[model samples]
Target chain A: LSEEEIQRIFGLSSEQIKSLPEEXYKKXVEXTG
Target chain B: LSEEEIQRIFGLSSEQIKSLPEEXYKKXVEXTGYL
Candidate 1:
């Protein structure tokens, strides 16, 4: 999913997105695909 | 969130994973982190 879709789906703020750990973020992307 | 973790955390079976709609699956992945 795209960043915008992730933000909307998760109800995350811009700050939260920016603050996500790199490892966790990558994992989420990989898992979703 | 690996497939293993996703199955464990969501209590989903391998069968369920195969059944999920693409949009719903992606939403779940994103929401898991938010939680």
Candidate 2:
């Protein structure tokens, strides 16, 4: 998944993603794909 | 202003910029402007 790939590219921790606003997180998923 | 700073850095739209996943956003901000 590009979303997962994008996260990995940036070295984002799982905890960090959990902390993001829900809307932001969803958009990231969309953009990366 | 790394958060704000990075938004400018990437030239991302306010909406696109706002949409960043926190982890990715934070990481990008952290990576730039330091060397």
Candidate 3:
């Protein structure tokens, strides 16, 4: 499950914050790797 | 302020929750005057 799906559906948490506004697209690699 | 503004600018709070998807458009009148 992607952070997009998680946030859009469930909303934010302090731990899993939104790294958007800061180049979130690149995170796919980090999440996968 | 409308819930839309409150939500769009800041975000949802555990206290002031989203009453939308539940006939929120009409509730605007209540915040201003007696419903």
Candidate 4:
């Protein structure tokens, strides 16, 4: 889905959207790394 | 985090909060069970 559409549906801002998933993975990967 | 607090931070209503996670799980679980 488009970022704007995902932003509305997920109720998150664009940068917040991109960052959260990255941070979640970084948290997990950073732990194992 | 508290529901109301999360509602404001995420800008999603509490019902949406509950429903989204549940729906996410249901979609994956239901599909896993879909066989």
Clash pairs, candidate 2, are none
Over 4 Å off, model 1: A1-29, B19-35
Q: Rate the local accuracy (lDDT) of all candidates.
A: 0.52, 0.48, 0.35, 0.41
Give interface RMSD, every candidate, in order. Answer: 9.1, 10.7, 17.1, 9.3
Top of the candidates by DockQ: 1
- TM-score to native of every candidate shown: 0.34, 0.28, 0.19, 0.26
| DockQ each | 0.13, 0.12, 0.02, 0.04
lDDT of 1 by residue, B1-35 (tens): 35665456546666766644443344445645653
Cα error of candidate 2 at position B12, Å: 0.8
Ranking by lDDT: 1, 2, 4, 3
Which candidate's lDDT is highest? Answer: 1
- Against the native chain B, each candidate's TM-score is 0.43, 0.40, 0.28, 0.37
**Compared with the true structure, what per-residue lDDT tens digits does model 4 show for residues A1-33?**
343543464455446555544332232233224
Location of the lowest summed lDDT over 10 successive residues in candidate 2 chain B: B26-35
For model 3 chain A, give the 10-residue run with minimal summed lDDT.
A21-30
In model 4 chain B, where is the ten-residue run with the lowest total lDDT? B23-32
* Candidate 2 per-residue C-alpha lDDT over B5-28 given as tens digits, one digit per residue, 9 for 90 to 100: 445645666676665566444544
Residues B1-35, candidate 3: write the lDDT tens digits.
34454344334354443343222222222322335
Model 4's DockQ? 0.04
Q: What proportion of the true contacts does each candidate reproduce?
A: 0.08, 0.22, 0.00, 0.00
Judging by TM-score against the true structure, name the best candidate. 1
Against the true structure, candidate 2 reaches a TM-score of 0.28
